């Protein structure tokens, strides 16, 4: 058990934006500029480091 | 070990392998089947 | 680590509402400038 | 001239849930955070028609016409008029050139539509210009919300714009107001809601809430 | 005389398709979803409303023909590790995989 909710909680931590326009990365990489589309991806990849 | 089975294993080695459920995905090719976060 | 097969492009519609364009065209009278006319469309695949 | 009398109380069993969304999911059990009509709750029974205060999202029962809405009243603002009509069930929005009762049984327009026993459901939330409209429509055997569980599934959409802030039917009239709250649904082998819990009802559909589960064991738990 | 307000360009235009695949790794858009896997048959029962899916954890597991109306069944490209075995450098170059 501990060890399946342990990653489950990991494929779940997936959805979340930690502050950022969504959580799917194509969509900021279309509804956002080029120059802007650098700050909100920083947001995702550091909370999933 | 019981020589009818074809795992060989004990009469009680069979009740104790029977009662503790998994949650592994070794498999070679895998609603959903647990192993989900494979993906 | 591996893979990637990603060839093709699956892409969706397949049936849909037309515009009413054309119903702005082949009709048998016209507004005289002294009354321009007006007709705004909205929410319908729009056929250019 | 106004058929009746106009007030009273009664309880909302488990009565009131809709399908929250259209992705399909089967033997799961989802914790919600939708706007639902919380169980054991007080239905304002009427039984004529003021101006009720529909306001944030409304159930409306009524087992044995249609209905209107509107910020205000008669033609001179937005409205609407679900209509069953037999032959078809039309509806329709504009001004609204009605009557201070158009008894049965105009200006700007900007969207149209058509197209014994019997447990006529209703939910009429209104969110993001989709004023929304869920039902469900089962026989009975008595007359009083008959405790039971039957989720309604979505029926229309119109992608209005009316501001609704009243309403009123046009000849059972069950009236319970909608809260947010939160609730864990049962999907069943076929992604049907087959059960549900509110977790605040009780102490214990709390701890099952936490749990995420319909069945809890013997112990002590942190809940809150 | 056309316009863009502040709600959506709705009229909006006809999009093509390029028909279904099925059994073979594949980029989509059926709907509006996007994503890349197998698209092989199906046996759910996708209630007459329901168009996607959802598995324990949220991640579509199922689509509908948006225009021939049957149960898909998303199933990802494979990947894994590359392990290298090696008999040592100082014996021979040659390797498995």
Redesign the interface.
Known sequence: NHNAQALNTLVKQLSSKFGAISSVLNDILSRLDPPEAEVQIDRLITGRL | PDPSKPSKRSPIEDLLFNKVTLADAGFIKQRDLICAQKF | ????????????????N??PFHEVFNATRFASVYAWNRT????????? | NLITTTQSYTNSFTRGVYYPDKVFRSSVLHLTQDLFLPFFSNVTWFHDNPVLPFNDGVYFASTERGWIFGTTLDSKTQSLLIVNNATNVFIKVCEFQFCNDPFLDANNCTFEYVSFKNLREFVFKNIDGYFKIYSKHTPIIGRDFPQGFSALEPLVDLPIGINITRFQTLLDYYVGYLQPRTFLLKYNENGTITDAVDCALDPLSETKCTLKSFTVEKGIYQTS | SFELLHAPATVCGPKKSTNLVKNKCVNFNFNGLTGTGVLTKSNKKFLPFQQFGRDIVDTTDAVRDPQTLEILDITPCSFGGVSVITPGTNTSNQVAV
């Open positions: 680590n591996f893979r990637q097969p990603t060839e093709s492009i699956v892409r969706f519609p397949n049936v849909t037309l515009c705004r469309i909205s929410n319908c695949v729009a056929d250019y």
